[PDB]
Each structure stands twice: as C-alpha cells, then as structure tokens.
A paper describes a structure:
We determined the structure of the enzyme in unliganded form and in complex with glucose at 1.54 and 1.40 Å resolutions, respectively. The crystal structure of FjGH65A was solved using the single-wavelength anomalous dispersion method using a KAuCl4-soaked crystal because the molecular replacement method using the reported structures of GH65 GPs failed. The FjGH65A crystals belong to the space group C2 and contain three monomers (named MolA, MolB, and MolC) in the asymmetric unit. All GH65 enzymes of known structure were dimers, and the amino acid residues responsible for hexamer formation in FjGH65A were not conserved in any reported GH65 enzymes. The monomer of FjGH65A comprises four regions as follows: an N-terminal β-sandwich domain (N-domain, residues 23–258), a helical linker region (residues 259–294), an (α/α)6-barrel catalytic domain (residues 301–641), and a C-terminal β-sheet domain (C-domain, residues 295–300 and 642–681). Although the structure of the FjGH65A N-domain is similar to those of the reported GH65 GPs, a loop (residues 71–78) in the N-domain is shorter than the corresponding region (residues 62–79) in LbMP. The loop is located in the interface of the “dimer of trimers” and is suggested to be involved in the hexamer formation of the FjGH65A. All the GH65 GPs whose structure has yet been determined to possess a phosphate-binding site consisting of lysine, histidine, and two serine residues. In FjGH65A, the two serine residues are replaced by Pro575 and Ala576, and the histidine and lysine residues are replaced by Phe625 and Met330. Instead, FjGH65A has Glu616 in the sterically similar position as the phosphate-binding site in GH65 GPs.
Residue numbers in the entry:
A (entry chain A), B (entry chain C), C (entry chain B): 23 to 681
The structure:
C-alpha cells in the first residue's frame, strides 16, 4: 500500500476508518467505508451558526453522490460483496471503490470534485456482468439535519436530442443565513431513445430519489455517470437556478470533456512536486501532504483554507495564522498563485480588520484570531485567543511581504501588499507601550504557546510586531511613500528577553512551564530574528522537551526538524520530521490528526509545517530578505538517496539534493 | 393617421388593440383602450421571481393613473361616449385621450412619464362643458396581484397655503425582495379654500380611492391634474417616505413648471432626428423607432433596456446583447450619453461576470446571456442559451471599444473600457482550444442562430472573440500597456471556415439548415471581418432565404438592408428595410412585435436594428476603426427624395443624402 | 458650583432636573436624578423607524448601568439617603454620585463611556462603612419598550484564575433593522476564590438581573466595578458574540488599565483648550461646550453628530448642516482629526447624494437636509425642508474645502475632497436658472431662515452656491484638473440683492418679516462674501431686531457676537455671546436647549456656534483662504483679563489675548 501516487485500503473496516477527501478548493467530499456512499460534503465560504463554539461554522451539506445498487432486486450490502477495495489517486483526486457482487458482477465507481468547475462533482460507475442481469440504480438526495425548510424537486430538461432528468433540492442553513441548492443528473452513453426511464420518489420529509432499471447482457460493461452541482447564496444570488444551469451545462459538456479539463488542471498542479529516492513511505506521505494542500486551496480566488481544509468541520472552517505561517509558505514556493489567493482572502477583509482595531481601541488593521465570511472576529468567546492572541496581525503582514519578496510584483505591492502592511504597522505602533528605559512592551496577550494566557512580552508576538514594522517600512521605501519614522524606532526597541542561561524567554512570567507548541523557537524560523547558530541550539535544547506528548498540535516538531536541518544535524532533523506527523496518523489512508493519537483529521496545518521541514529544511530553500528564493546549507535523512523539488519560485527551478 | 410627430387612433377597438408606451427610462405606462385607464405600469430596476422562466422579472406595478369619472352620477364608459380618440405625441411623450359625453362635456386627458423626474408621472384632465354638470372624480390605487402585503394610506399635508391630499400604497414583490411605494395627489387651479373636499374610501383588500365632486356651469373649462410618484427599495432605502416627499415636491412645483422641464428635456432628445422627404409613412415609422429608444433609455444612469424596453414584461426585463449590438449603435451616434448608460450597466456588473467565468471554469469576465439586477446569469434554465450562448461577452467588449472610438474619452477608457476589454479578452484566451494544426477553436456553443445548439466554431461567436481580443490589444496600446501577445496570436488563428461554394459556414455541422436569424452575415456588419464585396454578396445569396417567415425575430432583415445599401443596391436595401418591421406591426399605433405576425410588442431590439439600416445603411454612417464617424457609399429607396440625420457624433454633425 | 473642570448638583430635584451626558462619540449615557440609575443610553449609528416623524431615529437603548443597592435588606432610595451630590468631571467625562446611607456607609459611584473602547462602559462603586453591614447588589438589564424579541442570557466564563459572570441581552429595533447586544460583568479585587457568588434572576419578560451579597466590617472600603459592552449589527456582523468578547476582554484588562487608557485619551483631547481669566462662569460654560463637542465626536471614524450629539433622540439623531457650519469649524481648528470624521460621514454618503440629485432632476450630488445611516433624505415628510432647503449641499462643499485649507492634505483633497467638490459643483450648475439679464437665480427653496418657504434667491443659499462653485474651481487648480468654465461664470453672476434701505435682502419676497435665525448675516461670517464693515454693520443692525425671543434656535446670536468682535465692539460682542446660550440653559448642570426657555437639551449645534464666537470672534482666529490659520483684529469682553487658546491648526499653536 506504498504506491507513490495512490493511497489504497482493502476491505474498509467501519470500526476503524477515517475517510479521505477529494476536493477542488470549493467542495470537499469525505469517503465512507460503505460502497457507493460518501460520509460528509463541505462547501467552502458557506458559514452559519451551528454546533461548536456558538459562532459561524461550515455546515455538513448534501451527501449528493449517495447511491443504492441492486441486482435483480437484491441490494448491494457488506454480506454479499467481496474483493472490496478503495483507492485515492493523488494524481487526479479520483476516489475509487471496486467490488464483486457475489460471483455475478464487478462494480467500479470513481468520483471527483471537478478541478475546473468549483461547484461540480462527478461519479462514474462501471458494471461488468458474467450473466444477463437487471440493475436497479437509485441516487438519494437526503437533506442533512444541519439544514432546514428543504424542498425536493424533479424535472426533465428536453430538446429533440436530450432528456436531462434533474433531481434538485433547495434548503437553508440553521439561521436562514444561506440558501443551498444541489442538482443531480445521470449521464448515459446510449442516447435519448434507448436511455433508461428515470423515476422520482418523494417518500420522506428529508429525502427524495431518482432511479432506473437497466438490463445488462452477459460479458458486457454498462457505464453511467452521476453529475451534481452544489452552490449557495454565499456564491451566487440565485443558487436554485444556477445549480440546475450548471448540471445541464456539465451534462452537455459530457463525461469525456469534463474529465479531460479535470486532468489538465491536476497535471498543472503536479508540475510542482517533491520526489524522494530511498524511502517509499516518505515519498507517499509527502505526496499526500502536497495533495491535501492542492485539494484544499484554489488559484485565482479569495479563498483561504481552515486548519482542516475541506476535510470536515475542523475549527468551524475558520481561517487562522495556520494559513499565513503554516500552509502559505510551501504553497508560495511551489505555486505563488495559491499563495496569492490566501493573501487575497486577507486583503478583501482589511475593512473588517480596521473595524476590529477600532472596537478594541487600536489604530490601523487588527486581523481576527479566527476569520470566516466577513473578516470580523469569529473565535468562540470561551477561548481567550479571540480577544488576546494578537500575533495574527503580524502573521498577515509577514505573509504579505513574503508574497512580494517571492513574486517581485510591485503592482500587487502598491494595490494590496502596502494597504495591509501600512494598516498592520499602524496597529502595532498603537499596540506597544513605551516604558521608563525607552523600550517598547506588548502587554497582556495570549502567546503562540496558547497555554500562556494574559502574559507580557511574548517572544513570538513581539517578534511578529518587529517584522511587521520593519516590512511596512521596507515596503514604503520600495514604493516611494514616506513611512512614519516611529515604525523603525519602535521595531528596534521592542523587548525580546533572555533568561540567565542565555535562552530566549517565552514571556515575562516564563521559567520552565510546559508549552503547547513552538514559540521562542519561531524567532529562529520563520522570523529569522535569531540567526546565531549557538542561540538557535540553546533555544532548541531548552524548549524541545517542554512540549508534552498529549494534546499538543502539529505546529512544533516540523520547525525543530527544519532548524536541525539548518544546523546540518541529520539524525535530529529526521527524528523531528517523523515525530511531526507519524504519531498523528489515522488508518487506513494515513490522514493526519491535529495531535499525537488524535482522531480529528485532516489537519492541513500539520501538513503545511512538515512541507516546510522538507522544502526549507532538507532542501535548504529560503525566502531571501532581498527577494527571490535562495538555498542555504541543509542535510538529508541518512536513508534518503535523493530529494528533488520542482517548480520553485517564479523561474520554476528544480533543486536536487544528494549526500 | 400619418402625422410625422403623432400616432393617432379613432375609437379604440379593445378586441384588436396593442397599447402604446410613454416612458422616461425609469417608468413605462402602457395605454388601455378604456378612457382614463392604463393597462400596465413597469418600473425599471425592480426584479423578483414572477411567472415566466422561474427567474427574476419586471413586475406589473400600480396602474396609478386609473380614474373613474361620472357626470351627474352617470359613470363614463366606452359604451356611452362618442368621438373617442387617442393620440401619442412623440415630441414630448404625451398620451392623450379625448371624447364627448352626451350633451354635457368634452373630456381631454394627457399623461406623461416626466422626463426630468424619473419616479414622477402626471395626468392632466380638462372638462369643457356644453351644459351645467356635476362631475365625480375617483383615483383608484389597486394593488396588482403581482404584489402582496399591501397597505393603503391617506393623509392631508397642510400649511396656511395648501392642502395636499396624498393617496399612498406600499406593497411587496412576490418573494419580498422589493418594497414598492406609490403616492398620488390631485392638483387644482382654484386654491386651498375653494378646492374640492377629497374623500378617501378603503372598501376592498386590494383597492382604495380618493374622490371629489365639482359643479361646473355650462360653457366653462375645469382642469385638474393627478401627480403620482412610484419608487422601490431597489432605488432608495425608504420608498414609502420618499414617494410622499416626491409627490409633495411635484405638487408644489405645479403642472406648468413640471411640463416646461419635461418639454425642455424632450426638445434636447429630438436635436438628434431623422427626416425623410417623399415617404410620410417611413417618416412616422422612423420617428416611432427613435421615440421608443429615447423613451426606453436614460442618460446619466447605469440603466440598460430589455428587448421590450418599458413596454411590458417582454423577456422578463432582462438585458441581452440586444442592447450592445442592436439598440446601442444608433444611440451611440445620436446621443453618446445614452450609449454611456448602456455600457455603464455592464461596467457596474463586471464583478458578477468575473464570478460567472469562475463558476463555468474560465478566466476573466464572462458576461451572462441574460442580465438583471446583480449581473449574474438570469436565463431560464430550460433555455440552453444561458449556459452555452457565449458571444455576449464579445458583444459587450465591442460596444465598450465603440464607445471609446466615437467619444475619444481616454479617461473613460482607463477607468471603465479597459477593465471590461481586459477581463473579456482574458475570458476568450481561456475559452479557445488550440488544435493540432495550430488553429484556435471555440467548441460547444449555441450560435447567434439559436436553432443551432451545442455546435462548434459558430461564425458569429468566433468573430466576436477575434474582435474582443483585437480591441483589447488596441486599448492596451492607447493606455501605454503591453497586451498579452497571446491575444493577437489567438485572434489571428481563430477558425472561420468556408463551404465548397466559398460561403462562410455558420458552424462545423452547418450545410443548408434553416436559421433563426443573421449569424454569418453579421461578420460583414457589424463585425466588418468580411469587407470583400463578392464575399458579402455570396453570403447574402446563400443565407437570405434560410430565415423562415414564422417564429424568426427582428434581428436579420435590417442587417440585410444595411449590407445591400453598402453594396449600393437600392431595390434590395428597401425591400429588406420594409420586411424588417412592417410584417411585425400591431394596431392601432404600428407598434413592433418580435416576429412576423407576432403579438408581443414593443420589440425595441427590432427598432434598434432598423435604425442602423437607416443611419448606417441609407445614411452610409460608420464607426471609423481609427476613431469618430465616417460616411461610406450608400443609396436611398427610389421614393425617398431626401434623408437628413442630425446630431451625429461628438461634433453633432448633420448629414443630408439625395439621389 | 463654579469649578472650571466640574459641574456639581446638590440633592438632585427630579421635578426640575435635566440630566448630563458622558460619551465617547459612540455611546452616550444621560444621568438620572435617582442614585445608581441612568435615564437614557444612545448608541451612535443605529437607526430605525421609531416615533417622531415616521423616519429613521436613534433608539432608546439598554440602561445597562442600572443598579439596586440594599443595606441589611433595606433598599437605597432618594428618600432614605442624605448628603446626596452628583458631579461631572469634564477632565475625563466621569459622572460621580455620592451619598450617606443612615449610620451604615458612604457610597461613591463614578461611570465612564470608556474613551478608547467605543462600545464599553464602566461604573466603579466604593462603599466606606461606619458600621458592620451586608450589601445586596443587583445589576438589571431591562429591555426598553423601543426594542423587541429580546433574549436574556447568563453564563460563567472560567479558567483556573477567573470566573467572569456575563449578564447578556440581545434584542431588535422596531422593524428588525438592527440587532442590539449588551453584555455586563462585575469586577472584584479579592480574586476568584473569595469573590461573591453571582446569582441570576429572570423573573420578568423584559428584565433579568445578576446579584450578590457582601458582608463588610465597619471601617472598611469595599469596591466593585460594573463593565458593560453595547453594540449592534450596524457596527459588527455578530453583535451577540462581540458584546461578550468585549466584556471578557475589558474584565481581563481590569479597572486600573481601562481607566489609564481612558485618561490618556481625555488628556490628549484637552491639549486643545480655552482658558478665560477673570470670568469663572464663562470659563466653566466654555469648558462644558468643549467637553460636549469632544464627547459627541470621535476621531478616526465616519461618525457625524446630530444637533443633540449623544444627549438623547433630539432631531432623531439625524445629521444636518449643524455639523458642517456649526460644530465642524471649532473642531477643525482644535482637533482636525475630529473634523476629518465629520467630513468622512459625508464622503461615504456621496452615492446617496448622487441618487437624491437624480430623483429631483439634478446633476452631481445633492446632500439631504437630514441624513442618517444610508445618506438618503430622512426629513419627516410633513416638513418642507426635506424637499426644498438646498444650501446643505454647499455647506458640505464648504466644510470639505475648509478641511483641505486647514490640513493642507492634498492626498485627502484628491481622494475625498475633490469627489465632494466636483459632484456638489455639478449639482449647483444644474440648480441655477439664467435670466434675461444674464444673472443666475436659484428659485423655489426654503431659506436658512426656515420660516421663509418655497421662495426665490435666498441670500445664504446663493452664497453657499457661489462658494461651492469657487472652491470646486480652486480645488481643480490645486489638483491640476480642468474645471468646467461655467462654474466661475455662474459663481460671478449668482444674484445677491440689497433692499432700498441698503440691507442685504433675505429672498425675493422679503421686506420686513421676522426671521427664524441668521441667514443674510452668514454672508459676512462664515462665508466672507461681505467684507465691507459698513455693509456688515447695516445687515447686523437690521436683522438683529427680526429674531423673536420664542421658537428661535441657537444659530444666530453667536454670529452677531463674532461679527461685533471682528468690528472691535466689546460691549455688543459680549452681550450677544451671553444671549446666544444663557437664556437656553437647563438646571442643574447648565445644559443648553435649542431655543430660549427650551426643555430639549443638549443642543451641541448651539455650543458649536458659541465656540466659534470665542475662537474666531474673541480670539480673532480665521481659516485663511490661502491655507492654515491666521489671526485678524479682535476684542475681549471688558471683564475678561485674558483668553488663551491651545492646540490650534496642524502646528498646534497657542494664542494669548489681553486688553
């Protein structure tokens, strides 16, 4: 099960199964262990009050691919199939199930979140029978209990050439905030006169279905497709009509043209790749990390991923610094247009950040700890991160400057980077307090180490304020605008303190407490405020054992790996690489949970960190403060013969590393 | 009935009557055969789900002018009046009825959609007595069944000088999308103390009325006016209060000031005119065409006409390429500020076109087949045009570029034209497919000939893509920007094929099918991709008999006329000019239906086409590719002694043509 | 009772009591004569249909500070306390009450509209015991009858260190337009383990409460604080969660940190101050005027004050020219960043002014007589000012140009000032009529003297049209853009006439009528179209006799004062300075009513005028037509030994004047 392009599971065990996701950055479909079913469907950009946190959330959506297959009236069940296998093809995000029904027939089904059509899904079903047989096929549209006020429709769209039967539902999110429409059709090869008659049943309040029968002859394969479109009032004013329009459009494009477009967009994503010689498990794991980041982002949008991307309702679908510092850097090096969408998300929410700053008594733009539709603060009120974890503003500034460093797009810096950098620098200039000694303090925050609450002069927070102020000043210079000279004066005097052993102090109350995640070590990478290798090493030695095994998220060990790679320590770098994700895995597809032994995949934030350990750590790739991508000294794991990284920077460079 | 300024009807026949429209580009009022009634009122910019197509629509509104008149308690009806006449004065959009009631009085009523006050209507009533009589006058506000949740109000607005009685209704469009308010008052000459007492009745759920009595001695003229304001939440946040404010304002202005401003604005519109010597019927018909375009548009707005303007709910009030290619060109030459409003409609909806392109898997801006409030796709889902008729994007680009060519407004090109041309070119660059031979194809469209569905390389569509890419490239140069070299490479290699007889092929599946309307011939005019006179002629000979007599819209024969004028063939040009509209007329005012023998006037699209046959065909006027208006060779109909076109181009040039 | 920083009342008389306001430009809290109660709370920016005028209004909000205090089960009332005093400290907007309860304790309470946290309020209560006692403390959240569909919540926010009990309500404005959230907590000094248990009662439909008991030994001080956050959907998408988040934030900042931040911001505001030597009552009155303008405005916003600021529902909270001409000039000289917010309010409402112009048949931007949320007209329909008092458009233009003169901010002129000046100039160019003598008239207005309705060529109106046209032309020159030459042509020929007595004629129907307020005198100041001191004196001597004692607002005598100050006549200047506000005062805090003997305080318009009489009049300070502030000839009242004005202009200049 160590194909470098395919994740595979034989006989899914429903008692120990964590589904995999196919997604196009707009819709995510999470697999079921049951044949011809999906577990959960998530639509990006649709938020309403729902369950966790009493704040906006992603909403479980229509399981629009759900199918029932019968042979001569006998429904497919666990007890009557064999050689049941699932496979995820990471080359094209195809999720395939295959099984034999008794000794009678073989069934394959592949489904796709179409890469070029953000709101369109397709499942292709192939049935090969060894004897004459009749199939009954049903597609069910069950309204999930997350939605209300549903309506269940069915109609025929016809002309002299086609009969497109549409199974449509329209429903609302819990508070009525968003109207959802879904529209499904069956595609046949045999043409209007010979295609099966489609029946419609509405037997339940929350479910309707379309169905057909088809005679298949011995030794013949019968193929059909299910196309679905899923869209909301967050995406279009009239989702009901747009869903039916899209499904009609996709039906008359046809399966071939749809899969060809899908393949072309996936081929383009995989022009940036990471190849490992000598470690098939690492090769597959790293492909899975790239696959999930590619599936959970979309170029040419203003979409940003949640910590769980489109794998479910993890962290309510909210956007955190998990994007800017964890998922954004590897995407900026491999596909700058993905990074551009992530920062566009923030640019279009700058108004909401100015409003938050004003409500909390500050100048400029104060980005929220958790962001959703509006860009207003969305953190559950019971979590003190929302009111007090202020480094997110610096994290947004850092990503915006990095975008310009890697692309050199000065028109983007004028139109979007500078508005962000100027407003965020104005925030920090208003956020600091000058003390007796002329130093600048940032008092009463929640640390990057979120176990440290309502403390002063957090190392990471203060570091992000310094970088935000420096980068805003640098930006002003590049564009020929005059920056307040106070920004540089403040940056040079923001407190970063050492304990008596010379170790960077996490905050003013810090001695030897356990910490949730990397904080002081982040001043070495990503901030590069600490470059002295002896300082980097003494900070690693003091803090690396401060992170407990339990209830600590995957936002630490990838940084330890990267820093040990920069120190040219192969044994420590590889130890921390494995520790970053292997103890977090869930079967049968090695999806990644947030914490060690956790059960909440897929934590895309964790994948983003590990990709930095591979690209920036083992590959030595670095955003040069002066612009572009440079390469610094690195080591490989002992057992890696070659590391090849393709599509890096706007010159699309290939880097090869060997021992 | 061939007055060059007035359309007149004696004794309206309600069994064979198609009403005429007065409009100010915001409100349209369509005439009733019944005296002192109107059939329908339409407010621009107000759309909701209603009847046809399951998509947004114009909504029948308050018939706010409806009046009941009694003489000595005897109700005035079609059955008991004589010498009843109706007249539309095209000089000032006055609709006038006049009749005799027995031996008592002559009644004249004139109503107006006030040209300067977009939301204000006025009816003026004169009663000339032959005997002593008492009139009872009632103004009815009946909530049409298109509206719901109505409220019926009445109050006196007073000071020492006035008593302004306001009859107000507020109601909602079917889904609650739009709140409509209407407020009416009576104006009297005799002043506060002597004016009639105004009674209010609320006897029905869906109707209330204000009324008065007045004794008039024999041989006197008694005059009163009704002023109404009609506005919605689409136009103003508080329509209820703003309707009352507007009616009070208009009442205090008075009839004389209102009609003087109205006259001044209509006089300005008619400073661009078409004068024909030798053909009184042509002179009246052409004045009717100009009058309807002037009535159905408004300078200094973001309004664009539907194919039926404000004559009713034709095509749901949606905006089509009917504006860009059919109504826009004659308005650009006569009144560029009207053309500016039409293209402003599209500029304001550029973000909705970007959203459509993303949903359908393209780059840039994909303008919708049918547009309404948002600029999202509004085509009924049962019509494949909405998903597949893509030339509308090129049509918007062509109009944008022509606006700049005619005005030379480089500031408008920078702020609005270029955003349109750049985004629409980016769409076409993403829409084409390169083939093995290095040609660019546009596969799977609905043709301009909409009977050809899901075909490849439509002539008109491919031509609009070429022009969009060429004009965007030219625009970039005017503004000192380097357009992507790909735009010219694609433009130069987009497929336009010929059949073995050398005739331009309509699409890759086209041999000799009947066609709905002009498609390949549009490559000659308006696109001017075909300039060779033998090629123009070969294409006319092959396609001119491909358009059936039945169920074919007025989007063909005007182009045939214009092309035969350009070929200096007076007999063919005049044949096609008459065929373009005369078989489409409805009595008694020669309004134009969409198709031959049709009954759905007024098809403003057809008038726009015919006005191009007159201005660009008979007049030889042409948009110069290098800027401004030029004149090419033309002919007149044999029976036209002189054609005079005034107010052309930003120099407001007069063109005179004789034999 | 004549402290230069504090307003004091002994034993409030509920039968003759006009409450004083503490405000931060977002929340106003108006005092009750009853201990530990507030009369009214107003939230800026929240408007809905409510009572007066049938148009949008400020809404009475939660009296969130309402407290009930009992000693040994005995309820504290006005009738059983003694030595009860109230005091407003203008230095920090602290409202303090203090009283003795029998032989048990002294109670002191101080409340604040926190200056740095626009949505946060704090009350601090100190109990100083003379005997052992037990207090019962209740904080009540009563939903006012202005709101509907309330919900009453209570929860504990806890961690190892804190238990923050939140008393929260959520409700809606009358039409459901706005959702309001309020969240309160108690702060204690003693810590989580020792703090009182907080009980919650929900006994009424419209009220819930949180309460505690505390035993206090004799001779001890016990202190507690109430913090509350008040916010709406007009301010934030999710007011419910944002109110709770803000109160948690404020609780974990704590009383000391909040008051320090509050004091810092009030210290900054008072860096611009007016010091009078030899007249303690004038010193205190002028402080009260500065205090109210500082409390009723907020830098770095788009808020503009109503005529009553946040003192209540006066004039529905609508924005009038009372800002541009009355409150804006003193704030522009003292704190340009306050003036910037006031003009930002108009800039962000330019689209609505363009819409109003279009609806009334004009070009450009027509600012409404009364403005609220959208910028559309909000004047009650029964008042003709809404449709007909047109000088407001010139008033906005004047303020926009003055902002540029005083700041010299050319980037602001390009982005905001020019859009205002260009559109308002276009309005006036479309508003004038040229007569047979080549002069420009403005006909059928309501005058600045609002008693003159539907008249022609109002002096002040014509003056503002001239300045608007001139300043738009000067603006075009500053930015190097071409202005229509018609603006200068029109400005030079707009009619301002003299009657046969050599007095400027108010309008074309004016001879000797009583006038509501200053009109023709405003051509001298502020417009400075009349600089001839003899014409100023003629207009002064005539019109100063025409203002009746009754029903005439404080928009007159302050100008008389300033002009007599400019002519160097102390006795007259001082007479009109006193008449401007002293006859409009309400006890016991000398709050200002709109009219002489009025009962509708606080008329901040009136304070604005008088501050101009002091700064521009007695101080001789003037906005120089060429940029910055200059000083012309002035006099002081006989009895004033010295006038000092600090923080003037962007140079922050101090001006000292003596006899």
């Amino acid at each position: 099960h160590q194909d470098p392009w395919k994740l595979s599971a034989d006989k899914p065990d429903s008692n120990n199964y964590y589904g995999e996701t196919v997604a196009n950055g707009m819709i995510g479909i999470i697999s079921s262990p049951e044949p011809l079913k999906v577990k959960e469907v998530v639509l990006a950009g649709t938020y309403d009050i729902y369950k966790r946190g009493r704040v906006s959330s992603f909403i479980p959506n229509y399981n629009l691919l759900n199918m029932k297959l019968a042979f001569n009236g006998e429904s497919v069940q666990t007890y009557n199939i064999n050689n049941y296998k699932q496979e995820l093809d990471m080359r094209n995000g195809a999720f395939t199930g295959s099984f034999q029904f008794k000794d009678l027939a073989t069934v394959t089904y592949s489904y796709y979140a179409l890469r070029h059509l953000p709101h369109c899904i397709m499942m292709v079903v192939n049935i090969n029978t060894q004897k004459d047989t009749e199939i009954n096929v049903e597609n069910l549209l069950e309204t999930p209990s997350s939605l209300n006020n549903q309506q269940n429709y069915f109609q025929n769209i016809t002309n002299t050439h086609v009969n497109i039967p549409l199974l449509t539902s329209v429903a609302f999110t819990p508070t009525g905030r968003s109207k959802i429409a879904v529209s499904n059709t069956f595609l046949f090869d045999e043409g209007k006169k010979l295609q099966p008659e489609i029946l419609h049943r509405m037997n339940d309040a929350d479910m309707h279905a379309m169905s057909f029968d088809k005679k298949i002859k011995a030794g013949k394969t019968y193929s059909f497709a299910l196309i679905g479109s899923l869209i909301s009032s967050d995406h279009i004013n009239d989702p009901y009509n747009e869903a039916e329009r899209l499904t009609i459009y996709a039906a008359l494009e046809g399966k071939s043209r749809l899969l060809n477009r899908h393949m072309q967009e996936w081929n383009s994503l995989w022009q940036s790749d990471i190849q490992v010689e000598g470690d098939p498990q690492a090769q597959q794991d790293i492909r899975s990390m790239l696959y999930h980041l590619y599936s959970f982002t979309r170029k040419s949008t203003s979409l940003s991923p949640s910590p769980m991307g489109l794998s479910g309702l993890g962290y309510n679908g909210h956007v955190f610094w998990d994007t800017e510092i964890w998922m954004f850097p590897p995407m900026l090096l491999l596909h700058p247009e993905i990074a551009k969408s992530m920062i566009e998300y923030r640019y279009q929410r700058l108004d909401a950040a100015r409003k938050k700053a004003a409500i909390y008594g500050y100048d400029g733009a104060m980005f929220p700890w958790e962001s959703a539709d509006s860009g207003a603060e969305e953190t559950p009120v019971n979590a003190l991160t929302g009111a007090f974890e202020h480094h997110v503003t610096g994290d947004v500034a850092i990503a915006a400057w990095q975008y310009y460093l890697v692309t050199g797009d000065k028109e983007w810096l004028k139109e979007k980077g500078w508005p962000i950098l100027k407003a965020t620098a104005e925030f920090w200039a208003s956020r600091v307090e000058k003390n007796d000694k002329g130093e600048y303090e940032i008092k009463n925050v929640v640390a990057a180490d979120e176990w440290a609450e309502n403390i002063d002069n957090n190392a990471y927070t203060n570091g992000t304020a310094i970088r935000n102020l420096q980068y805003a000043s640098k930006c002003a210079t590049v564009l020929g605008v005059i920056a307040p000279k106070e920004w540089t004066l403040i940056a040079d005097k923001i407190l970063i303190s050492k304990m008596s052993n010379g170790v960077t102090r996490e905050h003013d109350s810090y001695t030897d407490q356990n910490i949730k995640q990397a904080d002081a070590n982040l001043l070495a990478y990503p901030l590069k405020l600490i470059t002295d290798k002896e300082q980097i090493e003494r900070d690693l030695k003091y803090y690396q054992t401060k992170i407990p095994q339990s209830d600590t998220p995957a936002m630490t060990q990838a940084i330890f790996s990267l820093l040990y790679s920069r120190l040219e320590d192969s044994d420590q770098a590889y130890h921390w690489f494995k520790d970053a994700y292997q103890p977090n895995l869930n079967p049968p597809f090695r999806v990644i949970s947030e914490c060690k032994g956790g059960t909440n995949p897929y934590f895309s934030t964790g994948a983003g960190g590990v990709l930095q350990a591979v690209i920036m750590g083992f590959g030595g790739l670095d955003i040069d403060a002066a612009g572009g991508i440079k390469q610094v000294k690195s080591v490989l794991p002992k057992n890696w013969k070659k590391l090849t990284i393709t599509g890096i920077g706007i010159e699309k460079k290939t880097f090869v590393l060997t021992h």
